[PDB]
Structure 1
Amino acid sequence: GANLERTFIAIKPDGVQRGLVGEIIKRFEQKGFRLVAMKFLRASEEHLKQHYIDLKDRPFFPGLVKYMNSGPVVAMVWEGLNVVKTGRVMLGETNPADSKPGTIRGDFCIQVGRNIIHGSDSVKSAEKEISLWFKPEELVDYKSCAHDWVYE
């Protein structure tokens, strides 16, 4: 059903370096979304080139890959109603210049090349990103104790 939608959220190396992991996770927990999966890694160049395969011809691509490999990331899957679209609202606009106060990027960063976090742009993108970053058995099935107070 619609309440079982999932999105991929990654905290980028700048978000880890600037000590924002706990703050970001809290935002998702407090909203009522369910954490499905989480790991911490330095993504290989090859892995990142696959993640960003659509951008391989963009002028910023070599620098993007180097930056995304320049420290570890936190990779996550979150579940809930409209979590892809709502996750993007919670992150704010991709360019922090346009991100509103109250959003993750609006509160915590400045420049588009150092924009702390990624969220899937669509359900189709989410499922592709989840398959790339996680093994199926890393996605945990459990029920939140407050589920019936979050959902009708």
Structure 2
Amino acid sequence: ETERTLVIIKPDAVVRGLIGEIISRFEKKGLKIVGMKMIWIDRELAEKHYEEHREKPFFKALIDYITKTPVVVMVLEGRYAVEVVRKMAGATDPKDAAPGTIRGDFGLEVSDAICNVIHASDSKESAEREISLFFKPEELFEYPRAADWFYKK
């Protein structure tokens, strides 16, 4: 049941100083950070990440948005991490996101792109692809978090 998912703390979150608060929500949930780094995504890498949206009217604005400032890419590991993180993120448009979710508590304002604080892989398949896009095997780790032993049988 243990999976890995990719999360991008977007430019709006970085600029607003919400990196720590976002990471804490994942740590408190029990999710493990197995990879993480601040990078500045260029257009080529951004378009590969968002290839599925190439023919949508908001594509250019989305690329402008994700490459606006540095972001923090990180890999989260844990039981059904993909669906769980998607649930924690909330509705794509923050105004529709439920209070308690990341977008629900932190997002609202938008530009020509729907600024929504973070990105979260939509599936195990997508996570695998996205993780490979931003990380090399040497940047991903296997280690114990404090409470890991508790769940072992």
1:32 touches 1:150 (CA, 8 Å); kept in 2?
no
CA 1:88/1:132 → structure 2, altered by over 3 Å: closer, same or farther?
Answer: same
C-alpha deviation, 1:143, in angstroms: 1.3
Superposition TM-score, scaled by structure 1 size: 0.94
What CA distance in whole angstroms lies between the structure 1 residues aligned with 2:74 and 2:151?
21
SS at the partner of 2:8? Answer: strand
What CA distance in whole angstroms lies between the structure 2 residues aligned with 1:151 and 1:62?
47
1:96 is matched with which residue: 94, 101, 113? 94
CA 1:111/1:150 → structure 2, altered by over 3 Å: closer, same or farther?
Answer: farther
What CA distance in whole angstroms lies between the structure 2 residues aligned with 1:150 and 1:18?
36
Q: Which residue of 2 aligns with 1:137?
A: 138
- Count of residue correspondences: 150
Instruction: Map Cα deviations across residues 11-58 of structure 1 (whole Å, 9 max, x no partner).
Output: 000010011100000000011111100010110100001001111111
Superposition TM-score, scaled by structure 2 size: 0.93
Instruction: Map Cα deviations across residues 54-76 of structure 1 (whole Å, 9 max, x no partner).
Output: 11111111111111111011000
What CA distance in whole angstroms lies between the structure 2 residues aligned with 1:139 and 1:124?
18
Q: Which residue of 2 aligns with 1:118?
A: 119
User: In the alignment, does 2:44 pair up with 1:46?
Assistant: yes
Amino acid of the residue matched to residue 150 of structure 2?
W
What CA distance in whole angstroms lies between the structure 2 residues aligned with 1:100 and 1:150?
30
Q: Percent of counterpart pairs with the same letter?
A: 50
SS at the partner of 2:79? Answer: coil
Which has more helix, going by share of residues?
1
C-alpha deviation, 1:80, in angstroms: 0.4
SS at the partner of 1:6? Answer: strand
Q: Structure 1: any 5+ residue segments left out of the alignment?
A: none
